């Protein structure tokens, strides 16, 4: 048995997305279909369930206004339509199904964004300091959408480095990275930044320099 | 609905370690059809959670038998026999009896070490920003453990919540720490209103804050 569900998608606030799960091999001892929310570091909650073999269907309470459950028996195919789509939709969602008194099997899940923003490179910062260690950094702030890739030194400095996890700054994106290497060793043998963002065909170094 | 209560929300261990994550319903889940459908799953980072558990007691197949469960009425029980390092993420608990399904706010399995102060670090809004009519202030708190912590941002000893942003790393593969980033975002023109910027790091290694501060001059 295997799940196959749609790609991510990214949507604006008021719309509707249909998102799509694919059921293999089954195939003739038929299968109850669950949907499950997770937010982004988030634990798991449970949407509802549908039946292929009769269209029946049973949504959780707090999801009866905001999702609706659909089938299409020639692709073997259910959906999920989310509508009136608001930032507190954004999450990934998982198709898992399960014949009676089965255990279940998991889809991939499907990332589902609500955002209004455009694509937008990031402005890159320096961080130098106002022992035997240094911690430099690089603050990479107002970009649109995920991800961005930072390296140190094209990537040949990776060692004691903490790139953080991203954030959202109004309606945009901001994470740091610190480096941190011997004392001894900078400004003399220099340290810089790089900063890649796919999306908006953007590559960037900023070379971490000492403070006037 | 039924609520289900697993504890603990953080369960550091060492490896070869017994572990044992609890999860308790708030009214019985004993299905019409007379199964108790529980169920235990282990989710890792970008992935889909992996059944490990279901009706309470049996193994799913290819799961190790490192890993039993049991319960019954309203307590139920994983237990993970000599934990190793594939073992470690967040375990959640399901109840598939009474609609609407529920699910247990999840335990992560971490790994124990010594207690270890952050290394505090604090960064002045770049030239490039200030130019920008921005004004970032940054703080590092790295690699320290145990995972809880708290910053505290003063702008001229003044305490600041508006505009700061925090973020946090997972546990470091290899020295086994957490870390964290705090950034105050000011405009240009309050930041040169004031002189001194702070951030204070509160950690279990003390009972007084690590302080990191600079004067704009």
């Known amino acids: 048995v295997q799940l196959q569900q749609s790609g991510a998608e990214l949507v604006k606030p008021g719309a509707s997305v249909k998102l799509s799960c694919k059921a293999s091999?089954?195939?003739?001892?038929?299968?109850?279909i669950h949907w499950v929310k997770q937010r982004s570091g988030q634990g798991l909650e449970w949407i509802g369930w549908?039946?292929?073999?009769?269209?029946?269907?049973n949504y959780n309470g707090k999801f009866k206004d905001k999702a609706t459950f659909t089938a299409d028996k020639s692709s073997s195919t259910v959906y999920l339509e989310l509508s009136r789509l608001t930032s507190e939709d954004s999450a990934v969602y998982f198709c898992?199904?399960?014949?009676?008194?089965?255990?279940?099997?998991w889809g991939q899940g499907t990332l589902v964004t609500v955002s209004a923003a455009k694509t937008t490179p990031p402005s890159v910062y320096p961080l130098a300091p106002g022992n035997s260690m240094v911690t430099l950094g690089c603050l990479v702030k107002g970009y649109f959408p995920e991800p961005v890739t930072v390296t140190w030194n094209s990537g040949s400095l990776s060692s004691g480095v903490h790139t953080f996890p991203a954030v959202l700054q109004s309606d945009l994106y901001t994470l740091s990275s610190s480096v941190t290497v011997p004392s001894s060793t900078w400004p003399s043998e220099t340290v810089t930044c790089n900063v890649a963002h796919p999306a908006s065909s953007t590559k960037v170094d900023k070379k971490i320099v000492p403070r006037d | 609905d039924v609520l289900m209560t697993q504890t603990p929300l953080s369960l550091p261990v060492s490896l070869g370690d017994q572990a044992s994550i609890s999860c308790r319903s708030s009214?019985?889940?004993?299905?019409?059809?007379?199964?108790?459908?529980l169920e235990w799953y282990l989710q890792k980072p970008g992935q889909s959670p992996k059944l490990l558990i279901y009706?309470?007691?049996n193994r799913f197949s290819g799961v190790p038998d490192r890993f039993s469960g049991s319960g019954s009425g309203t307590d139920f029980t994983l237990k993970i026999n000599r934990v190793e390092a594939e073992d470690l993420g967040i375990y959640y608990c399901?109840?598939?009896?009474?609609?609407?399904?529920?699910f247990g706010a999840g335990t992560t399995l971490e790994l124990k070490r010594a207690d270890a102060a952050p290394t505090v670090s604090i960064f002045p809004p770049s030239s490039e920003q200030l130019t920008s009519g921005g004004a970032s202030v940054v703080c590092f708190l790295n690699n320290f453990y145990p995972k809880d912590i708290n910053v505290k941002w003063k702008i001229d000893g003044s305490e600041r919540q508006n505009g700061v942003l925090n973020s946090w790393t997972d546990q470091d593969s290899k020295d086994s720490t957490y870390s964290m980033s705090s950034t105050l975002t000011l405009t240009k023109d309050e930041y040169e209103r004031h002189n001194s910027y702070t951030c204070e790091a509160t950690h279990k290694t003390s009972t007084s804050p690590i302080v990191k501060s600079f004067n704009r001059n």
């Open positions: 898992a199904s399960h014949a009676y008194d089965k255990e279940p099997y």
């Open positions: 009706k309470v007691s």
């Open positions: 549908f039946y292929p073999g009769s269209g029946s269907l």
């Open positions: 009214q019985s889940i004993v299905h019409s059809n007379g199964n108790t459908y």
């Open positions: 399901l109840q598939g009896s009474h609609v609407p399904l529920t």
């Open positions: 091999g089954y195939t003739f001892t038929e299968y109850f």
